């Protein structure tokens, strides 16, 4: 997982490109192209 | 200070339970939907699955063509046979399959006769006794109308009418009647006399609840669009258990609303939500009961139950008085107005009361509908509103069509129905029309309205739906304590 990758949300399958990683409250968060934070454990890499 | 995120509370009245007229049961409005109420479904099922066959031509064929002698013992044997064959048992043709008896526990073949000597030596298991079920005067009237004739009532299983349509019932009864005839009298399985039996039981001596509607309407027989108002009046059995004319007319109004306005119009000719609050307005609270009792009191105070002959003046007087009283009651009590929030509900209730009053004054059903239409066009001027637009189509042409004699417009209100050209589309009219037709005869204390055979047939105690007190049964169904037939749980897996 890194900026510019392609990820999909496992629960719904929304496709987007990772914009930035913005840790908060000692917890990793992933920002996609839809300006929505996600969780790395609920995201996985696709090619 | 204006906060747009406070919201607006809505529907306070609809949260409160709906009482049922002449009962003491409170039910939710969601439980009065015809899909959620098993009692309304069973009402329609019992009406749909009933066919009356006159077993007199068949006896004459057996006597004069086949040389077979018909005696009460032979009729008892035939009844025993048909009670086994009609649900789907096998009588001839070795190697048949049979329907599960658990799915046809509501299937009965009953016999009634106006001949007392023949009714005496008949098995009381299969006999609909007119003497026992009706008071003396009503029993005598029904026997005089029926005559020395024997009739068979076939109630095919409800599952049959639920899988198939309503046109299945007459054919089902005819096939089973023919089979029972050829196996009870030891005849050849197929000859000319068999065709005579089949023709008699298929159309010559058969009585259908509803006529077919071919063409544009496109429906088979025994559908709610084919049931005339007099037939539905004769289905309701309050006339033989109560002497209050208003109560009889109002039970017929409740049954007519629940059948026509709910089932026929909100499902057969519409869909989705349907028209539940349009129909329950006539049988939930005593509003219609109070208006009808006021109409009867006024009529008995100035005219009498049959003290006047139907003229225009009495129609104007009674309909105007009852309409003014009903609208004044709506004005005086905001609870009544918020109960009947829609204009159509109010218009139908006031016009039904006015028509019932005119019928109780004159004993004529066409005068009753004339009073109903006067009430509608007087309501319109009183409140400057009638109902949803599209409601007063028949109410505008009504006055002209009520006493008309032209081919497309003339019919006695007992002979009218949902297939009457004006009445064919709009809700909020038909159940009240049936009630007015019944009130035309409750004024005279008549035993029946249009068909004595239907009255005797639905006086049967083995029907699943109790037609003596339709509102009580509707309330029972709304409270999930009404047992309905047509369910198939013996052939289904455990859930």
């Amino acid at each position: 997982i890194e900026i510019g990758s392609y990820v999909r949300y496992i629960n719904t399958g929304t496709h987007g490109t990772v914009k930035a990683i913005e840790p908060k409250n000692d917890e990793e968060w992933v920002l996609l192209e839809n300006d929505i934070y996600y969780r790395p454990e609920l995201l996985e890499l696709v090619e | 200070l204006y906060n747009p995120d406070i919201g607006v509370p809505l529907g306070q009245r609809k949260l409160m339970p709906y009482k049922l007229s002449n009962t003491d049961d409170y039910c939710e409005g969601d439980d009065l939907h015809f899909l959620n109420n098993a009692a309304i479904q069973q009402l329609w099922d019992d009406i749909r699955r009933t066919v009356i066959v006159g077993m007199d031509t068949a006896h004459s064929v057996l006597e004069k063509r086949l040389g077979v002698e018909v005696t009460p013992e032979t009729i008892n044997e035939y009844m025993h046979t048909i009670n086994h064959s009609l649900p789907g048992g096998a009588v001839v043709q070795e190697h048949m399959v049979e329907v599960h008896p658990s799915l046809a526990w509501d299937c009965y073949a009953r016999i009634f006769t106006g001949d007392d000597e023949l009714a005496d030596e008949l098995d009381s298991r299969f006999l609909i006794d007119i003497n026992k079920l009706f008071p003396e005067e009503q029993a005598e009237t029904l026997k005089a109308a029926i005559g020395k004739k024997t009739y068979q009532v076939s109630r095919v299983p409800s599952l049959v009418g639920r899988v198939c349509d309503g046109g299945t019932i007459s054919r089902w009864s005819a096939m089973q009647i023919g089979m029972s005839f050829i196996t009870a009298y030891k005849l050849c399985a197929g000859e000319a006399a068999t065709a005579d039996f089949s023709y008699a039981s298929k159309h010559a001596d058969v009585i259908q609840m509803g006529n077919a509607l071919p063409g544009r309407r496109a429906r088979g027989p025994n559908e709610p669009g084919g049931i005339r108002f007099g037939i539905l009046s004769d289905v309701v059995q309050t006339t033989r258990v109560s002497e209050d004319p208003v109560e009889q007319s109002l039970e017929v109004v409740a049954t007519g609303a629940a059948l026509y306005d709910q089932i026929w119009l909100g499902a057969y000719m519409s869909g989705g939500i349907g028209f539940t609050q349009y129909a329950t307005a006539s049988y939930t609270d005593d509003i219609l009961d109070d208006f009808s009792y006021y109409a009867l009191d006024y009529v008995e105070k100035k005219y009498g139950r049959m003290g006047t002959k139907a003229t225009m003046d009495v129609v104007e007087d009674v309909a105007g008085e009852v309409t003014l009283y009903a609208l004044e009651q709506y004005d005086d009590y905001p609870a009544l107005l918020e109960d009947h929030f829609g204009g159509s509900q109010r218009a139908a209730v006031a016009a039904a009361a006015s028509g019932i009053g005119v019928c109780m004054a004159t004993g004529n059903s066409n005068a009753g509908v004339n009073g109903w239409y006067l009430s509608q066009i007087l309501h319109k001027e009183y409140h400057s509103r009638l109902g949803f637009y599209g409601y007063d189509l028949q109410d505008q042409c009504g006055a002209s069509n009520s006493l008309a004699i032209r081919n497309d417009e003339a019919a006695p209100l007992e002979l009218r129905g949902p297939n009457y050209p004006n009445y064919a589309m709009n809700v909020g009219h038909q159940g009240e029309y049936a009630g007015i037709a019944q009130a035309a005869h409750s004024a005279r204390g008549d035993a029946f309205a249009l068909n004595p055979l239907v009255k005797v047939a639905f006086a049967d105690p083995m029907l699943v739906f109790d037609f003596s007190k339709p509102r009580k049964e509707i309330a029972r169904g709304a409270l999930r304590e009404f047992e309905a037939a047509g369910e198939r749980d013996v052939i289904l897996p455990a859930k």
């Binding site: 969780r39 | 919201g7 306070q12």
Partner: protein, 194 residues
């Protein structure tokens, strides 16, 4: 096993054969742990899916209050192109009564677009973790798509101060909730409360 005393509402129910609760009313369970929020006192919400959750929590040993919203039916006025049919809202006193509880359990319906915006308006004024009990399968991300704080899917620009802490699907309005759903709700409450 400890005594549980409820402050019954001060107003009566809906008529004779109707419901026992009244719209826009609150019944404090003394010790404030969980508040169950019902959209209306009607048969679609009260005693069929809501008092069942109430007695499940009260059986688990956790005191419960039940609040019936004054205007719980419909969609908020802030929904796209406004609301239709009815307007959903939360009163300041209702918000204060909710906010003194450790956790909130709220029962929602079928349509997803209605539930998301109703939850957003609800959490605009509620600052405690809440559990959404609905019928439809709704994912714990569509709320974040319109700005709602969510435990698993946070939004970049949060428009609410409340956190949707759990979503439970399969509870139908007006129908008895099976023991499995009650057990799931109780487990979520226990693990997200203490």
């Amino acid at each position: 096993r400890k005594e549980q005393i409820v402050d019954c509402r001060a107003v009566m129910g809906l008529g004779e054969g109707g419901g026992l609760a009244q719209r826009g009313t609150f019944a404090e369970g003394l010790r404030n742990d969980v508040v169950v929020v019902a959209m209306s006192p009607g048969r679609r919400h009260i005693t069929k899916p809501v008092c069942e959750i109430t007695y499940g929590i009260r059986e688990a040993g956790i005191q419960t209050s039940v609040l019936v919203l004054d205007a719980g039916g419909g969609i908020p006025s802030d929904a796209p192109q406004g609301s239709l049919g009815s307007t959903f809202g939360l009163k300041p006193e209702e918000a204060k009564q909710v906010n003194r509880h450790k956790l909130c359990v709220i029962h929602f319906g079928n349509v997803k677009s209605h539930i998301i915006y109703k939850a957003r308006l609800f959490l605009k004024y509620v600052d405690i973790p809440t559990i959404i009990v609905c019928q439809t399968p709704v994912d714990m991300e569509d709320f974040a798509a319109i700005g709602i704080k969510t435990k698993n899917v946070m939004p970049l620009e949060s428009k609410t101060e409340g956190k949707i802490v759990e979503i439970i699907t399969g509870v139908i309005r007006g129908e008895s909730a099976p023991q499995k759903k009650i057990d799931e709700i109780i487990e979520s409450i226990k693990k997200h409360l203490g």
